Structure formats: C-alpha cells, structure tokens
Amino acid sequence: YATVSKTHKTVSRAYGGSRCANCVKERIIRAFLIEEQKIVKKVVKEQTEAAK
Amino acid sequence: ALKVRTSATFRLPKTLKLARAPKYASKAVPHYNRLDSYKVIEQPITSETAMKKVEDGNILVFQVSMKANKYQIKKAVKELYEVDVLKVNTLVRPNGTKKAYVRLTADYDALDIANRIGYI
Amino acid sequence: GRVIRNQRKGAGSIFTSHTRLRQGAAKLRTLDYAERHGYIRGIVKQIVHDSGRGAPLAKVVFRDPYKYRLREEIFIANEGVHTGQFIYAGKKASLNVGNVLPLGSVPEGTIVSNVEEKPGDRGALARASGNYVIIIGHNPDENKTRVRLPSGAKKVISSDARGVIGVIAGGGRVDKPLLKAGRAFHKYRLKRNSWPKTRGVAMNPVDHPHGGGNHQHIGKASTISRGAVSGQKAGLIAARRTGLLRGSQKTQ
Amino acid sequence: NPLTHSTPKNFGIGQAVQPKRNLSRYVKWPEYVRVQRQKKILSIRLKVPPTIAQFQYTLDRNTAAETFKLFNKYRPETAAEKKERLTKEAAAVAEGKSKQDASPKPYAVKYGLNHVVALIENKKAKLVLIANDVDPIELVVFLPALCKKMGVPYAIVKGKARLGTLVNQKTSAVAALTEVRAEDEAALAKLVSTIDANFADKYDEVKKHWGGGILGNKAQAKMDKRAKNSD
Amino acid sequence: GAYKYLEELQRKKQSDVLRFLQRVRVWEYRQKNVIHRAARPTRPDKARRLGYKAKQGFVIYRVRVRRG
RNA sequence: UUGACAUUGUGAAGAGACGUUUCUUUACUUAUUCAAUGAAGCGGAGCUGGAAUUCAUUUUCCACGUUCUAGCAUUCAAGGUCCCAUUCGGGGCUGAUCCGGGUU
RNA sequence: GAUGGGGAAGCUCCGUUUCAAAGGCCUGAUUUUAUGCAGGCCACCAUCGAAAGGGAAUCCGGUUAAGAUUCCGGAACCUGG
C-alpha cells in the first residue's frame, strides 16, 4: 500500500477506508438524533426545575 | 513558595554533559590507512578460465584483500589502472582468498589493459 | 526412595500453565475517582472465548478520564451481557446486570460475580463458569458487608470491595459427561500437564507411599496428618472424616 | 464577538478529559527525597528525649541579628592579611626585637569543637553559640550541659551554615568569643543578659521535658474530630 | 576535646538519648542500599581512634549484613 | 509445632504482685508486616442552597455536574477579567474555594 | 538472560519491571552560530532466542569440464536518497 496511489486506498466519504457507508449513515443519524435529544434532555429538566 | 508539576512523574533532570578535552592523546601517532589500494588488490588471477573472461567478457580478474568490499575494490581498480568499472562481483574462493570479477565499461578493453599490466 | 510426583510439581518445568493462547488476564478496572465517587460508562465491544477457561470473557472499553484515548479492560462475562451493552461502574452505578458496584451499595439479596477480596484488588471470588456470591447483610461498624461464597463459606469483606451484578456465564458446563479420554486430553492441553494420572498403588515403593506390591493396596491409612512432611502427603490430607455421605447443604 | 462563542466545559465524572492540574501533592519523588522527609517525620512522631529536645529552641530573628552583628566584628585573619603580617612579623622580628610581638594582640571568634570545648572547660569562654543542626547530634549534645556546669553563657543558635560564614568557612558547628575589645563589653553583656535568660536559666526546666508526639494532619484531625463531634 | 565526651556518651547505649538516636538511625540505614557510601563518619571519636583522618583519600562506607 | 528471650515503642479499663509497678480483655502509629497506583483527587475546614432548633443562636442535620440509544469527549479551555501600546504573539488571575505536603 | 537491588563465607543464587532520580523525539529561539538553548508531548521500558513461524523487492532465454532465480542478454520490481 506504500507503492500505491491514494485513490486505491480510500473512497470519497467521511471515513474513506476506516468504515463502511451504512456504518457512517448509521453514524451521522445517531449523532444528530442524540445531540437533538440532548437539548431536550436538557430543556425538559430545566422545566421541572422551575416546577419545583 | 511551591511550583507546579502537572505530571505526577519525577524525571532525571537534564544536565550539562561536557565533552572530552583530554590532556594527553590516546595513540601517539594515528595508524596509517590499513587497507589502501596496493593492499586491496593483491594479484591478478590468471588461470585459463579467467583468461577467457579477459578475452571474451571485458573482465579483469583479481585476488583481492579478504578484508575488501565491492566499493573498496572498484576504487582501487579505478585508480591503480586508470580505467572505469561496470560492476564488481566477488566470491570467497575455497582456499580462503577472495576473488573479484571486475567488468570494465565499454570504453575499455580488458585484454589491452591486461597485457599493459603485463600478463597473458 | 525417589521424589514423588506430587513434589515434582513445585519446580515448574513440565508442569507450568499452558498460556500462549490465553486472551489477556481478567480484571476489574483499576479503582479510580470515577468509581470511588460516581459511575463511568463503558461498552462491551466483543465477548470472547479464553483458552483453558470455560466461561467467556467480555472485552469492554471505557474512555480515559485523564487523557484523550480509549481503554479496554477484560472482564469476565456475566450471562445476559451483550455486545453494545453499556456497562456502568462505581458507587453510584445502578443495580443492573453487568455493572460493577461496591458491595456496600447493593441491598441484601443481591447476587454478584468477580468480587474483590480487599477493595481494589480487581476481582478474586466467584469467577468460574456459573458461579456467584450472595450478599447476605451489611454492617456500618466499619464499612463491612457479609457474603456467601460459592463454596458454602460466609466471608465478611469491606463494603468497598466491588462485585459485578449477575452470575458468571458458561452455564452448567460440567453437566455433560466428557465421554472419552480424548476429550480430557484436549481438556487439559489448554490448561496444564496434570493428566492422565497414574495411581500410586500401581507404582513401586521408590515412587510413592502406596508403592510396594504382591497385591495392589495402600497398607496404611490413606489419611495423613496435616503436619506430615512433603514426600508423605499423598492421599486424604487432613481428612476430618472419610467415606460416603449424601451431604446436601453447607455452612448456615 | 457574535462570532466567538462561550462553550463551557463539563469536567464532571463521566465527561471532558480532566484538565491539567497541580499534582505536586502526589509526585513519586526520588528515594532520597522521601527518606529525608520521613526521617524528619519519624523523628517528630516518637517522644524525643529532653536533651535532644533542647534544640529547636532557636534564637529569635532579632536577638540572633544582634548577636551576629557583634560576632561579625571579630572575623579571623584573612589569607592576604596573615601573609602580609607573616612577612612583616617574621622578616623584622626574626632579625629584630619583641618575641614576634611586632604585632598587636588579636581578637578573633574562636571556633572548632575541640578548641571551644576546652575554652569552656577552662572557664575562658565569654559566650558560646551552638548550632541547632549538628549531625551527628552527639557532637554537640553535651555542650549546653557543659556550659551549665561551667557558668559559660550559651545560645543554641540557628544555622551551622551561618556560624560558617562567621569564620570564613562552609559550616562551623560552634563559635564563641572569649576576649573582646573594651568598646564592647556593653553590647556583649546586654546580649548575654537576654540570651542567658532564654537559654540557660531555663536549662533545669527544659531538661525535664520531652519532645515528639504530633500526629500529622490527618491523624491529628481524626482525633480532633473524634473528640470534638463526640463531646 | 569533644572526643572524650563522645567516647563516653557512646558507652551508654541504653540511655534515653541513645535509644532514640539508635531507633531513628537504624531506620534510616535500612531504607538505604545494603552497601552505600557515607558522607561523614557517624562516629568521629571512633573513626579517628581506629586510624581514620579527615582528609582526601580516607573514605567511609556503610554496610548491612544478614545476622545469625 | 509449642514456649522463653531479643527485634519492642506510647494510653487506658480489670483482675492481680507490696502513687510507682509486674498480670487478662484494648485504645495509639512511627518499628515490622501485606496490597495497589504513571504515588489523582486523601484529611480537616469552608461559598452556596433547603429544612431544623430555638420561644432566637448557632444549636446541627441534608443536599452540592454523568443511566432510554454499540455516537462525540485531547492542543495549559472556551468564557470572563487583567496586564505588554498589543502589528502577532505571548503572559497572569479566575473558570476549577481554602488549609495541611501523610501517595492510597 | 545483563542492570538499581535482595540472599550467600564464597564459587555465585534470586529477580526482569522488579520497593531505582533508569530516556529521547520533534523543532523553535539564534541566525555570535547550525546551535547551547526556549517550547513541548509520549516511555513501568536491556538483550539473546526460528536457515520449517512472521517478513520490502526478479523473471524468461542463453551459457560451464565443474557456477548460476548470482554470470551473459533482455525485460522488471523494492528500499534509501
């Protein structure tokens, strides 16, 4: 692999070698969904803070 | 008073480390070049089958120091004989000497330079 | 006579453990501020067979609190735990299967595995396929919890000692007859040079106390004082009794 | 500004790699560092007996400053000095009069254990400074006791290094003057008065008490708390 | 001389001062290496008496042996 | 294996030997012993907050960053505040309370 | 199987990250200089032990009394620069 052009050992996506398309597709989603639900996980416990 | 170590590891402090500025010299006189040119190359080899290499392969054949090497041999050949060199092969003969096949570049004819040196 | 077989073992040699294929060794996390005060969440990345040890291991990985990197420990896997599972460790971790809690933080009744003998030793008790220890009660006269060990014995250790909720995995491996010598062969091949076993009674006197002959037989009680000297301890060692029982429970 | 952002970080258990902090409290120091630290401590825990406990009674910053300012007036001869005299002294006297009394009587500090002990024994010492930190202590433990028998005023002073500088050396152990210029018996006695009170009258009482005990933070606290919450 | 009092103090190995001294010192020597260089003689009156002098080329080593 | 003596030190209860002193359970920690860790978060006290007493006070208790998810977590930390005339670079103090240097 | 060490009268025995102050990698400063230094991370870490284990890269033709994936001819590839 040291005698080979870079195009031979990657693809054009987040995580070229490394991971496998369906695994970055899962990967992004899981990121977005959780970071969203964070905000909520956060705002929701700030509501029930005032309620006290 | 204190000081901040952000590592819980204590290291050996990096410290001066002078340099030897002797006082009396190791040797009295530095050895002359062991293994110079007259010592690299010791003898032609002139068996009939080496001779054929001269006549037909543009190769000079030499017994050569056991301690030599393809660099050191090429250099000596290049200077004792004022010729250019294509590659050197070597082997250690079974009598314990080292023989060197030195092929000359095509600007030279080994047979010519063979009998300049003065064998045939 | 001659140095007997059971004495030759101390010298290692031909008798050391066969360990090439073993995974790493199996341990809790080293006990840190994370675990001493809160919890720390790892995932179980893979679960894996370890040569010589029925009972599978869990390779579970945690973030490093003081450096940017990942840290993989090798737990013993606990039945029900499963790749992708989160594993919570420490004082505040909640009572689920697979987590590791200080004994002092679980209620009486709780059953745990791979439990420490002294806090921080990283796991000593109930580790083999199928085993576990039961917490029987607590005593904050110095931080102690009293437990039941798989052997029957009760033992009181520090409520700071940690266990992992659940039982060790690997079922009732012993419930299946071995069937043929070859299975024992392969069995001991990943463990150590302890198999087959020649009876002393089939050896000559030089070789063993059982030894002499003309008919095979022990010729003296096979029941040895604990204070007997090595060379002499073959048989039933400080046997407080001997013979068939049908026993049925232990120490309670 | 509206472009930069305030992204606080969470540093609790379970997130954010903990930030560099100060761990001097926790370093695995080199073994000689520990030994000199534990030695001090081992020596603190454990009843220290009266005669070793005499020390640690230093001499206050001001009385010491006073006593050095006087002692500093009596430097021994320097190298250059004695050379110069030895040529003046010898070249003339050894071909002229007064038995090398071709130089005035000197007044110097008097130092060196053997020397200074005998001065004390011979009731020839006017005041004596014993360092608090001679090791081995046996070199110096008999001194206050000796001085007590002999009448000799004495102060355990701080700095073996400092009595050094007082005689043009690295360290000096003792130092004690005997003679003294008459423009000076005044200060001398004023020192000896305050000193003697502190360090000499108190002898018979000091010699009756032990040192040591002391628990070190943690233990001292859990006996602090043990007896405080539970009383 | 300081020495005549060293010489005599040292003879009271069961006195309060010396038990203290002995207890603290033996701890120290145990934490150092079985053989190690000593900076100064622990015992000046003694070194001396056995022929040591305080001068370049005289050396003191401290050593531990197993006992029994 | 069992006893004595040595290593061996400091406080008490008692029963005991005629205020010291030797005897059966015991407090101490520095000797000795055992375990771990790249000696990281020990010990004491406090900011904050909620209840309490007390017939008002300091008189204490209690709380004080992570649990739907097989993500992500590093560049003395962004922020704030100071300094250098500050061109770009740095630095200090907070962020991250204090105080013992007993690694636990 | 050396080493800080611990045993042993001693030949030496034990131990190998071990109760040890156990390094060296980048490059700025400085351009008095290619160089001392100013940054800084990372290090429980000798070495020996495989011609059947792991592993960078070569082929066909021709040639000698006896050598050849090694010479010749031709055609390649790897590694460091």
Swiss-Prot record, chain B:
Family: Belongs to the universal ribosomal protein uL23 family.
Keywords in alphabetical order: Cytoplasm, Isopeptide bond, Ribonucleoprotein, Ribosomal protein, RNA-binding, rRNA-binding, Ubl conjugation
Name of encoding gene: RPL25
Localisation: Cytoplasm
Any single biological process term in GO: ribosomal large subunit assembly
Keyword Iron listed: no
Superkingdom: Eukaryota
Organism: Saccharomyces cerevisiae (strain ATCC 204508 / S288c)
Main location: cytoplasm
A GO cellular component annotation in the UniProt record: cytosolic large ribosomal subunit
Protein name: Large ribosomal subunit protein uL23
Curated annotation (Swiss-Prot), chain C:
Domain of life: Eukaryota
Record-linked Pfam families: Ribosomal_L2, Ribosomal_L2_C
Keywords assigned by UniProt, alphabetized: Cytoplasm, Isopeptide bond, Phosphoprotein, Ribonucleoprotein, Ribosomal protein, RNA-binding, rRNA-binding, Ubl conjugation
Keyword Ribonucleoprotein: yes
Keyword Phosphoprotein in annotation: yes
Gene3D superfamilies linked to this entry: 2.30.30.30, Nucleic acid-binding proteins, Ribosomal protein L2, domain 3
Entries under InterPro entries matching the protein: NA-bd_OB-fold, Rib_uL2_dom2, Ribosomal_uL2, Ribosomal_uL2_C, Ribosomal_uL2_CS, Ribosomal_uL2_dom3, Ribosomal_uL2_RNA-bd_dom, Translation_prot_SH3-like_sf
Compartments where found: Cytoplasm
GO BP field: cytoplasmic translation
Classification via SMART domains: Ribosomal_L2 (SM01383), Ribosomal_L2_C (SM01382)
Molecular function per GO: RNA binding; rRNA binding; structural constituent of ribosome
Summary of the function given for this chain in its UniProt record: Component of the ribosome, a large ribonucleoprotein complex responsible for the synthesis of proteins in the cell. The small ribosomal subunit (SSU) binds messenger RNAs (mRNAs) and translates the encoded message by selecting cognate aminoacyl-transfer RNA (tRNA) molecules. The large subunit (LSU) contains the ribosomal catalytic site termed the peptidyl transferase center (PTC), which catalyzes the formation of peptide bonds, thereby polymerizing the amino acids delivered by tRNAs into a polypeptide chain.
Extra information: Present with 4050 molecules/cell in log phase SD medium.
Protein name: Large ribosomal subunit protein uL2B
Source organism of this protein record: Saccharomyces cerevisiae (strain ATCC 204508 / S288c)
UniProtKB/Swiss-Prot annotation, chain D:
Role noted for this protein: Component of the ribosome, a large ribonucleoprotein complex responsible for the synthesis of proteins in the cell. The small ribosomal subunit (SSU) binds messenger RNAs (mRNAs) and translates the encoded message by selecting cognate aminoacyl-transfer RNA (tRNA) molecules. The large subunit (LSU) contains the ribosomal catalytic site termed the peptidyl transferase center (PTC), which catalyzes the formation of peptide bonds, thereby polymerizing the amino acids delivered by tRNAs into a polypeptide chain.
InterPro entries linked: eL8/uL1-like, Ribosomal_eL30-like_sf, Ribosomal_eL8-like_CS, Ribosomal_eL8/eL30/eS12/Gad45, Ribosomal_eL8/Nhp2, Ribosomal_eL8_euk
Gene: RPL8A
UniProt-annotated location(s): Cytoplasm
Keywords assigned by UniProt, alphabetized: Cytoplasm, Ribonucleoprotein, Ribosomal protein
Covalent S-S links between cysteines: none
Source domain of life: Eukaryota
Gene3D superfamilies the UniProt entry points to: 3.30.1330.30
GO molecular function term, any single one: structural constituent of ribosome
Subunit structure: Component of the large ribosomal subunit (LSU). Mature yeast ribosomes consist of a small (40S) and a large (60S) subunit. The 40S small subunit contains 1 molecule of ribosomal RNA (18S rRNA) and 33 different proteins (encoded by 57 genes). The large 60S subunit contains 3 rRNA molecules (25S, 5.8S and 5S rRNA) and 46 different proteins (encoded by 81 genes).
Protein name per the record: Large ribosomal subunit protein eL8A
Family: Belongs to the eukaryotic ribosomal protein eL8 family.
One GO cellular component term: cytosol
UniProtKB/Swiss-Prot annotation, chain E:
Function: Component of the ribosome, a large ribonucleoprotein complex responsible for the synthesis of proteins in the cell. The small ribosomal subunit (SSU) binds messenger RNAs (mRNAs) and translates the encoded message by selecting cognate aminoacyl-transfer RNA (tRNA) molecules. The large subunit (LSU) contains the ribosomal catalytic site termed the peptidyl transferase center (PTC), which catalyzes the formation of peptide bonds, thereby polymerizing the amino acids delivered by tRNAs into a polypeptide chain.
Places the protein is found: Cytoplasm
Family note: Belongs to the eukaryotic ribosomal protein eL15 family.
Positions spanned in the full protein: 2 to 69 of 204
Protein name: Large ribosomal subunit protein eL15A
Source organism of the structure: Saccharomyces cerevisiae (strain ATCC 204508 / S288c) (Baker's yeast)
Miscellaneous field: There are 2 genes for eL15 in yeast.
Assembly and binders: Component of the large ribosomal subunit (LSU). Mature yeast ribosomes consist of a small (40S) and a large (60S) subunit. The 40S small subunit contains 1 molecule of ribosomal RNA (18S rRNA) and 33 different proteins (encoded by 57 genes). The large 60S subunit contains 3 rRNA molecules (25S, 5.8S and 5S rRNA) and 46 different proteins (encoded by 81 genes).
